[PDB]
Amino acid sequence: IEEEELTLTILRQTGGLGISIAGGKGSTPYKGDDEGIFISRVSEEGPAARAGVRVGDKLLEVNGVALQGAEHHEAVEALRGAGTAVQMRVWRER
């Protein structure tokens, strides 16, 4: 469907999650006028790739906390925590 809603769980690595994020409140939108947090890069054969994350996915929630209204730095901080796993709910435009 138009927006596929997926729940993806990244098994963290000492090198991180293997993704780059773009966007955030007050920053230049990744697409349209949407200030949300988006996956802009996925490292091939990295943790996020193994978890099924894809470029263009919109990040709605990280470890059960909404990113609604999040500035870029908040999203970065949310993804640089100590947990060995990162659960994210994303919307994927098909």
Partner: peptide, 8 residues
């Protein structure tokens, strides 16, 4: 504004 990207 600025188009921010951060590797994570």
């Amino acid at each position: 504004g600025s188009y921010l990207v951060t590797s994570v």
